[PDB]
Amino acid sequence: PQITLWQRPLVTIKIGGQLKEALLDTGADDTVLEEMSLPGRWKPKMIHGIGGFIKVRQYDQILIEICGHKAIGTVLVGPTPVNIIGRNLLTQIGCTLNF
Amino acid sequence: PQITLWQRPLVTIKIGGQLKEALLDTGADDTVLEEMSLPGRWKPKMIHGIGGFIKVRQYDQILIEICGHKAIGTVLVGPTPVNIIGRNLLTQIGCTLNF
Numbered sequence: 001p002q003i004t005l006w007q008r009p010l011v012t013i014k015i016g017g018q019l020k021e022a023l024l025d026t027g028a029d030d031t032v033l034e035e036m037s038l039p040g041r042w043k044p045k046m047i048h049g050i051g052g053f054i055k056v057r058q059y060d061q062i063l064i065e066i067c068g069h070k071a072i073g074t075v076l077v078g079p080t081p082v083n084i085i086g087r088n089l090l091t092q093i094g095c096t097l098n099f
Numbered sequence: 100p101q102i103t104l105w106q107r108p109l110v111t112i113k114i115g116g117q118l119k120e121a122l123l124d125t126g127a128d129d130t131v132l133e134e135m136s137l138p139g140r141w142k143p144k145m146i147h148g149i150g151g152f153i154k155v156r157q158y159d160q161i162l163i164e165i166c167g168h169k170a171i172g173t174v175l176v177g178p179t180p181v182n183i184i185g186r187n188l189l190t191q192i193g194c195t196l197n198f
């Protein structure tokens with residue numbers, strides 16, 4: 001697809017059977033999702049956002065689908081205001097920026 | 100041009116006669132640059148990200164030159180970790196997300 005930025009690039013992702021809306025975010029190294037429970041063991045991580053730092057829960061090898069593209073990878077769960085699809089999964093689906 | 104997400108999408112911008120480096124951020128509504136001396140008037144605003152809320156000095160109709168293309172828009176100056184080019188200016192230089 002080709003997406004323009006007149007509006008927030010919200011997209012539909014399916015994570016473990018459930019459907020959620022996520023924003024394609026080029027400024028995010030990683031993928032951060034709102035609070036939830038995934039199928040595994042988690043480790044602690046600290047991420048830095050604009051307003052400061054947050055502790056998140058790292059899960060690995062998580063399968064997620066993004067607009068029909070399935071991805072497998074690291075997902076961070078924490079107190080984020082919105083689900084964010086970072087570059088770790090953006091690189092996987094073939095996403096690039098163009099002008 | 101086409102930008103890949105393997106690394107942080109950093110670009111060089113010229114604002115106020117100064118050359119800066121900034122992140123092409125599709126997750127950002129606006130453009131927020133680190134604390135700098137810029138001439139003009141301004142009114143405060145508040146915004147938030149993953150860390151929380153920050154108070155920024157809002158400046159409007161500012162000319163920024165991003166990778167060769169000139170552009171007019173609002174610029175927020177505050178405690179941002181990195182200079183950010185938000186959707187407000189990414190739209191102006193014709194940037195799209197493709198995958």
Ligand SMILES: CC(=O)N[C@@H](CC1CCCCC1)[C@@H](O)C[C@H](C(=O)N[C@@H](CCC(N)=O)C(=O)N[C@@H](CCCNC(=N)N)C(N)=O)C(C)C
Pocket residue numbers: 025026027028029048049050081082084122124125126127128129130131145146147148149150180181185
């Ligand atoms: C990982 C992360 O943290 N990466 C940041 C970018 C940046 C953070 C500092 C280090 C380098 C990378 C953003 O890429 C993520 C994005 C974000 O921080 N973007 C803000 C900032 C720009 C701005 N001040 O506009 C934003 O868009 N703020 C809007 C509210 C929209 C949120 N959406 C809803 N609540 N629905 C606002 N008007 O305050 C998420 C949290 C939504």
